[PDB]
Design a protein around this ligand. Sequence first.
Ligand code: GDP
Length: 168
Amino acid sequence: AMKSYEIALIGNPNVGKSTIFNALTGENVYIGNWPGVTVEKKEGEFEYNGEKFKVVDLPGVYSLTANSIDEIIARDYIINEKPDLVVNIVDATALERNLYLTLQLMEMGANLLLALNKMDLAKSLGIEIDVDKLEKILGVKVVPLSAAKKMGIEELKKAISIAVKDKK
Ligand SMILES: Nc1nc2c(ncn2[C@@H]2O[C@H](COP(=O)(O)OP(=O)(O)O)[C@@H](O)[C@H]2O)c(=O)[nH]1
């Protein structure tokens, strides 16, 4: 009946991935781990419009090399599980370093959406981001938000429903 999609959340540690995951899924959540390791695996889902969205939280990583079991898990999933959409959660207060992962993600031909979190913190720290320039330079859609202050989440949901169609 209801059409489904699979989306993955990935970014550096401490960017608000857990906060965004909870905001998107609420009570619909299973918590376990990846096979044979003590790396936590969070999965949940939300309904938006008439469509259903399975959300997998990938391990927080700084790059997608193979220097850790986390990078391995994350890379294996992105490439071999082929999610309809990778939501790359990026911290606006440390853009440069967050974008290292982003570049690798683009390399892999991930269907990508950029969630530029912590806009409040950046503003309060005097950090300026030209979101439009960023969107332009990367050729990826950028959704500014502040998940901890419950701002932009709805915007994000909408952008997700739109971005998954870009896998076709
Ligand atoms: N200022 C601010 N803090 C945030 C935001 N989102 C998350 N945080 C805080 O950043 C810290 C780490 O967030 P968390 O979701 O646990 O990050 P994760 O490690 O990427 O999963 C927590 O203290 C959050 O409250 C935001 O939009 N603005």
